[PDB]
Amino acid sequence: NYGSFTKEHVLLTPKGYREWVFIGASVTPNELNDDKAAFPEFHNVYIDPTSWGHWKKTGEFRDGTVIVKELAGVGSKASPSGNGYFPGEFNGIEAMVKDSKRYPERPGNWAFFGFESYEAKQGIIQTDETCAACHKEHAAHDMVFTQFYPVLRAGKP
Amino acid sequence: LNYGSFTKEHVLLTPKGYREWVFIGASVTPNELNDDKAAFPEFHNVYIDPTSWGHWKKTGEFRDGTVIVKELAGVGSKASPSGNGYFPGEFNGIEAMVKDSKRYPERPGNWAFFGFESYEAKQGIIQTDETCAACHKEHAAHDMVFTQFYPVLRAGKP
Numbered sequence: 001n002y003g004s005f006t007k008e009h010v011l012l013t014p015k016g017y018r019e020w021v022f023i024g025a026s027v028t029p030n031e032l033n034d035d036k037a038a039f040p041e042f043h044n045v046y047i048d049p050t051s052w053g054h055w056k057k058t059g060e061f062r063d064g065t066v067i068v069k070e071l072a073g074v075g076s077k078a079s080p081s082g083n084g085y086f087p088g089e090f091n092g093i094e095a096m097v098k099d100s101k102r103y104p105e106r107p108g109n110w111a112f113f114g115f116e117s118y119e120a121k122q123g124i125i126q127t128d129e130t131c132a133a134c135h136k137e138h139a140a141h142d143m144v145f146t147q148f149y150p151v152l153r154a155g156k157p
Numbered sequence: 158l159n160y161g162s163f164t165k166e167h168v169l170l171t172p173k174g175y176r177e178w179v180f181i182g183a184s185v186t187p188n189e190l191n192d193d194k195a196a197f198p199e200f201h202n203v204y205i206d207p208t209s210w211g212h213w214k215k216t217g218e219f220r221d222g223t224v225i226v227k228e229l230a231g232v233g234s235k236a237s238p239s240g241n242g243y244f245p246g247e248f249n250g251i252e253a254m255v256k257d258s259k260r261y262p263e264r265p266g267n268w269a270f271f272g273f274e275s276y277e278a279k280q281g282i283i284q285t286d287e288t289c290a291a292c293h294k295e296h297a298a299h300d301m302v303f304t305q306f307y308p309v310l311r312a313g314k315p
């Protein structure tokens with residue numbers, strides 16, 4: 001079980017998630033979003049190893065699934081490989097945890113967490129309006145935007 | 158504990174399970190920003206093997222036996238509920254590089270670079286130094302790897 005939680009079932013700030021299973025990266029640069037992306041700017045997304053094993057067998061997110069979206073800045077727009085976007089420095093993380101026992105009234109049993117900094121002890125749980133509304137509305141599978149996770153789409157049975 | 162499988166002629170066999178290796182960073186060179194034909198289209202998701210990641214945490218150096226896989230994917234869209242930008246589509250192919258001072262004593266940095274004809278190919282095709290190493294040698298921040306674009310590596314070294 002890769003998440004740890006407070007008494008009130010708040011996700012403690014994940015550690016070592018960069019050693020979890022990467023499932024996809026997207027980029028919303030500030031310069032293409034009126035100088036402020038909602039989630040600036042590169043997004044590197046990870047699912048915990050245990051939930052990955054379960055996804056390879058079921059194509060479903062189990063209770064205990066932790067997904068971390070790590071934000072990084074655009075570091076440059078041209079390299080020897082051509083023009084585009086290339087990452088810079090880390091900016092922070094978002095996370096979501098699915099758990100029908102801890103979050104029985106949350107849409108999809110998912111809890112969404114923001115993090116004040118990489119130094120924070122624990123996440124801040126989010127109201128449904130702030131995160132779950134957009135994800136339920138538009139994500140291809142169980143409030144996870146799998147249309148942007150080719151690792152997931154190719155790993156499911 | 159090495160992650161590269163090789164023929165007897167030291168040819169790297171097509172890496173399997175590298176999507177469970179340690180992701181070190183992602184970039185994108187969209188076709189539309191490169192004359193409709195990027196050199197490596199389009200998203201690049203880069204992995205380093207778990208043993209060499211463990212060694213990199215300790216030393217900030219690539220051990221003998223390092224395998225790095227660059228997985229290419231398409232731009233699947235440019236707009237999503239999160240904003241405008243680039244979002245990946247389907248998998249396009251892989252590039253790889255393997256460090257080995259005994260198998261590859263005459264290659265710059267002892268790196269062998271491999272292209273792969275498709276995801277079905279049994280093995281890679283080792284590349285001449287002109288085709289890959291020359292660019293990597295000449296611009297990569299560290300030991301022919303573009304660590305300026307791998308924040309995972311930079312933050313994970315001592």
Ligand code: HEC
Pocket residue numbers: 026027028043045067068069094095096112113114126130131132134135139143144145146148237238239240244
């Ligand atoms: C990516 C995200 C992830 C990664 C898993 C996933 O479902 O994709 C997490 C854990 C997370 N966000 Fe989310 N989000 C949105 C989109 C389109 C993507 C994938 C493409 C990309 O990386 O840009 C996400 C969309 C939205 C959004 C639409 C207006 C809302 C308001 C949010 N997301 C809000 C939140 C959170 C509230 C602070 C939060 C903790 C999220 N998302 C977590």
Ligand code: HEC
Pocket residue numbers: 079080081082086184185186201203225226227252253254270271272284288289290292293297301302303304306
């Ligand atoms: C990315 C790459 C990687 C990942 C490791 C790394 O050093 O970044 C591999 C294994 C690989 N390529 Fe290379 N390449 C270049 C640049 C700037 C980046 C990182 C930024 C990005 O992802 O876009 C690379 C540069 C170049 C280049 C400059 C003109 C050439 C000709 C090549 N690369 C050629 C090759 C290969 C020849 C077929 C090959 C097997 C590569 N790269 C592997």
